[PDB]
UniProtKB/Swiss-Prot annotation, chain A:
Molecular function terms from GO: ATP binding; ATP hydrolysis activity; proteasome-activating activity; ubiquitin protein ligase binding
Lineage: Eukaryota, Fungi, Dikarya, Ascomycota, Saccharomycotina
Included stretch of the parent chain: 77 to 234 of 467
Keywords from the named record: ATP-binding, Cytoplasm, Nucleotide-binding, Nucleus, Phosphoprotein, Proteasome
Quaternary structure and partners: Interacts with UBR1 and CIC1.
Protein name according to UniProt: 26S proteasome regulatory subunit 7 homolog
Record family assignment: Belongs to the AAA ATPase family.
Function comment: The 26S proteasome is involved in the ATP-dependent degradation of ubiquitinated proteins. The regulatory (or ATPase) complex confers ATP dependency and substrate specificity to the 26S complex.
Annotated compartments: Cytoplasm; Nucleus
Other remarks in the entry: Present with 105 molecules/cell in log phase SD medium.
Record's keyword annotation contains Manganese: no
GO cellular component, as recorded: cytoplasm; nucleus; proteasome complex; proteasome regulatory particle, base subcomplex
Organism per entry: Saccharomyces cerevisiae (strain ATCC 204508 / S288c)
Swiss-Prot record, chain B:
UniProt family annotation: Belongs to the AAA ATPase family.
Protein's UniProt name: 26S proteasome regulatory subunit 6A
Localization terms from the record: Cytoplasm; Nucleus
Function: The 26S proteasome is involved in the ATP-dependent degradation of ubiquitinated proteins. The regulatory (or ATPase) complex confers ATP dependency and substrate specificity to the 26S complex.
Mod. after translation: N-acetylated by NAT1.
Whole-protein residues included: 113 to 174 of 434
Organism ancestry: Eukaryota, Fungi, Dikarya, Ascomycota, Saccharomycotina
């Protein structure tokens, strides 16, 4: 059912010659951008159509077109590691009141961690 | 003999081309990264005062 609504855009978001982009990283910036590919190949191009001159930064992954290389959209850096994506947890089951006792070792951790996050102006 | 230049692309392809007037033989040196045309394989560009790159970690602070 949800696939039928996305097939209408299939005449644009699919058959277009833009989307087949080659991802790479710009090694050198001259304000001419030296960009190194994943195949151990480099080239030099300029800005794109919607590309802003201040968006491209030194040492950032920048996707380019597959046929005629041109900067199209920037991408966040450090795309290689897949390991740290699973290190972030969500909603731990242990709550704040699960630690037994009134011991002051609890008060020391909340003031050095929870306090500056909740009340940074204190 | 004549003046010419032997270039090697980053794709490991060795191409022979004659000396182009855009560059000079005294300015050219071995182990130099310059540009070439994708079709005709001729040097249209000079060296932008840097060879290779900074690779990964480089710290430049004012």
């Amino acid at each position: 059912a949800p696939s039928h609504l996305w097939d209408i855009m299939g005449d644009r978001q699919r058959l277009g010659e833009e989307h087949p982009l080659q991802v790479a990283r710009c090694t050198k910036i001259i304000k001419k951008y030296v960009i190194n590919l994943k195949q151990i190949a480099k080239f030099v191009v300029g800005l794109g159509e919607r590309v802003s001159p201040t968006d491209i930064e030194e040492g950032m992954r920048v996707g380019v077109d597959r046929s005629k290389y041109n900067i199209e959209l920037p991408l966040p850096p450090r795309i290689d590691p897949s390991v740290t994506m699973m290190t972030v947890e969500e909603k731990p089951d242990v709550t704040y009141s699960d630690v037994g006792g009134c011991k002051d070792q609890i008060e020391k951790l909340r003031e050095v961690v929870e306090l500056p996050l909740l009340s940074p102006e204190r | 003999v004549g003046k010419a230049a032997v270039v090697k692309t980053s794709s490991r392809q060795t191409v022979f081309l004659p000396m182009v007037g855009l560059v000079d033989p005294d300015k050219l040196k071995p182990n130099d990264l310059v540009g070439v045309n994708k079709d005709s394989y001729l040097i249209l560009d000079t060296l932008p005062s840097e060879f290779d790159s900074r690779v990964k970690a480089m710290e430049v602070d004012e």
